[PDB]
């Protein structure tokens, strides 16, 4: 294979992640494993998220992942939710949670 992506057996474009790291003034020089590693970690996470979004889409009987589905995904996962603990998703909405003391007895 020609694509460095394939050499790494990755979906993400390792050539892109390589250009970016240079046109980005993070350091003089960039290693060759760093793009690879990063391009992969990017993939793990988009996968990790898309997984939970799809499930969210499924319960809501839907073919197509819309941001509510990403939002539900993110704030239901303790850990993803913390990675994006200071982030807003356009059209997210919030998690259904109503405080106890506001419920009738």
């Amino acid at each position: 294979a020609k694509t460095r992506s394939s050499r790494a057996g990755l979906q993400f474009p390792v050539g892109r992640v390589h250009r970016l790291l240079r046109k980005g003034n993070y350091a003089e020089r960039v290693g060759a494993g760093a793009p690879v590693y990063l391009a992969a970690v990017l993939e793990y996470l988009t996968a990790e998220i898309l997984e939970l979004a799809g499930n969210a889409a499924r319960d809501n009987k839907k073919t197509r992942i819309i941001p509510r589905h990403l939002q539900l995904a993110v704030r239901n996962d303790e850990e993803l939710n913390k990675l994006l603990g200071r982030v807003t998703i356009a059209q997210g909405g919030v998690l259904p949670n109503i405080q106890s003391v506001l419920l009738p007895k």
């Binding site: 509510r68 807003t88 059209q91 919030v94 259904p96």
Partner: protein, 97 residues
């Protein structure tokens, strides 16, 4: 006739607005507001319609986050009704000014 008891429609409305994602502030008022404030910083500014929409997305998120924490403060005080002083405690603690 018929009359839902106090607090009954509140609970309903909460559930309504917690299922959806559509913006709660009306679109036009919102824009007029943003154009004002921005004018008073620099005159003769235009906006990408998506740039307003960004600021609103960002605005509502904040306020809903805010009410969330306000609400906690009401409840902290063995109360169920939110009050300016509640908001005020949330912002002091958030470390806003």
């Amino acid at each position: 006739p018929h009359r839902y008891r106090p607090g009954t429609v509140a609970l309903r409305e909460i559930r309504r607005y917690q299922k959806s994602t559509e913006l709660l502030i009306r679109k036009l008022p919102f824009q007029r507001l943003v154009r004002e404030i921005a004018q008073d910083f620099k005159t003769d500014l235009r906006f990408q319609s998506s740039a307003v929409m960004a600021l609103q997305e960002a605005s509502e998120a904040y306020l809903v986050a805010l009410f969330e924490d306000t609400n906690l403060c009401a409840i902290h005080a063995k109360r169920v009704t939110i009050m300016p002083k509640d908001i005020q405690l949330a912002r002091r603690i958030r470390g806003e000014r």
